[PDB]
Design a protein around this ligand. Structure first.
Ligand SMILES: [Zn+2]
Ligand SMILES: [Zn+2]
Ligand SMILES: [Zn+2]
Ligand SMILES: [Zn+2]
Lengths: 300, 300
């Protein structure tokens, strides 16, 4: 009694732990961020206007989309969306990365306008921003890393460079009142670095959305595993795609010389395929060797 | 010699015509839009009209992403991205819809600021904007509509309402100099309508990106078609998802009572499945009746 669902539990329990573990850190980070929100209010009474609220507001806002997607991803499979809502944490994480591009562009425009209209508080604001951001970096931070932690961490550590830039600009100005042109150019030399560290995340997250082969698995390795069976002769129209970052699905065709005894081949191939990676699901068809064609364009 | 690729040509030639036909209209629209761009330059020599023509700038830009995606979608399938770049026109169209939300939000901010700082050229600018936009509506505008024409059309016809709002505001002010508060509120009553007509596009385009069942096909109808075969007994873990708007893929399990004679079942089921809809591809496994289990967390 070899049911085809026997090996699917390996990728079921591993996923369950990841979403519970991920929900633990964001809730801790959200509360820690909320504590530092009240610090600005306390300082407002005792100067009063500080721009740290804008940076901290989007950070807390970016920590509610990910919790919402993780809360939403637990829904049951339906007639529509047959695979389930398990891809909702890719779209949820993509919106977080988009915020970094939009936020940076706004600050570039404000820094650019300093040229046409040139003009202790700077030091204290930079210290608070560089303190809160650095703390959350450590709090946030074999199977590949979660698609949501890999986005929230980039958001927190991406904006740490902006706090570095203002500290350098304020320190130079406070010691040298002249050469005020360094402040507008200080942001430009550091605004690019935020746009560079978010490139390896966009590429690793965009190929999933167009059902490309995910990192950690190889097309050539999987093809060799199937061919180890004696019965199989050739594989065509192989298909690998990742439903999420650490869940993969397989689909293929298999050609065998013997028209009969096809029941035995399915048990051996499915067992051999699962002995290399925990697959979310696998669907393997069997075609007799007579039905193969030499020069089909779809076959290649 | 019933090759499994025989019926895949039905959904191959139909797709080929759609991308060639779609590339014909955008090129015509881009040139027509370019002609009206030169009208702004001609009027510049002979008055606060560049701002009116700023709307036409993003429209031409929005018509280059779609042509780029259609140019890019023709690339060959590779080891990575096994299915191909055929989903690049969903991501390309999604970015066009996002532009509508960002552009509208900017115009709301400028219209909102009129309250704090109240303050023939309006008529001529509105006439030109309402003329060019209306012409492109007709130029742009059974298988479902293309995912790129359904986005470019919404962009052109979405911003026609903004040109309507300025015409109403200018006409009322020109006749009644007083009651200047109608101009700031004129945009608000018409900025919402742009955000409403773009909702049925976002939903119909987002469920494709999370591999949901596309419009035009039904889960219950497909399940009944398979069961018409005498051999098949039960189907579990059915899976439908749309690679693009008018291309669908099928994957299922089939349980049969007779352990032998499985070669005949595959030919009948595949022929019967293709006689309801032109599928991009189909992969059907066969499982013996013994391997079925009374209950599972995956079968249901
Ligand atoms: Zn099964
Ligand atoms: Zn073929
Ligand atoms: Zn085949
Ligand atoms: Zn089962």
């Amino acid at each position: 009694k070899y049911h085809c669902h026997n090996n699917n539990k390996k990728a079921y329990d591993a996923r369950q732990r990841e979403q519970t573990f991920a929900k633990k850190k964001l809730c801790i980070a959200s509360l820690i961020c909320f504590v530092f929100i009240s610090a600005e209010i306390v300082g407002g009474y005792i100067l009063a206007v500080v721009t740290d609220a804008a940076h901290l507001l989007v950070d807390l806002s970016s920590f509610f989309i990910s919790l919402c997607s993780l809360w939403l991803s637990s829904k049951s499979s339906t007639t529509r969306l047959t695979f389930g809502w398990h891809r909702a944490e890719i779209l949820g994480a993509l919106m977080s990365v988009i915020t970094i591009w939009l936020v940076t562009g706004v600050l570039v425009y404000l820094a650019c306008e300093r040229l046409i209209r040139p003009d202790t508080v700077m030091l204290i604001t930079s210290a608070c921003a560089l303190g809160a951001n650095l703390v959350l970096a450590l709090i946030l931070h074999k199977p590949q890393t979660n698609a949501s932690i890999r986005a929230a961490f980039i958001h927190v550590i991406g904006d740490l460079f902006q706090s570095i830039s203002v500290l350098i600009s304020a320190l130079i100005i406070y010691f040298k009142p002249e050469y005020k042109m360094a402040d507008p150019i200080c942001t430009f030399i550091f605004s690019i670095f935020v746009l560079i560290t978010t490139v390896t995340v966009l590429r690793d997250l965009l190929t999933v959305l167009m059902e490309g082969t995910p990192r950690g698995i190889h097309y050539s390795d999987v093809k060799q595993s199937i061919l180890a069976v004696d019965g199989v002769k050739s594989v065509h129209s192989l298909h690998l795609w990742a439903l999420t970052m650490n869940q993969v699905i397989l689909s293929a065709h298999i050609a065998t010389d013997i028209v009969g005894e096809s029941k035995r081949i399915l048990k051996d191939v499915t067992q051999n395929v699962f002995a290399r990676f925990p697959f979310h699901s696998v669907t393997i068809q069997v075609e007799p060797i007579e039905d193969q064609s030499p020069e089909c364009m779809f076959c290649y």
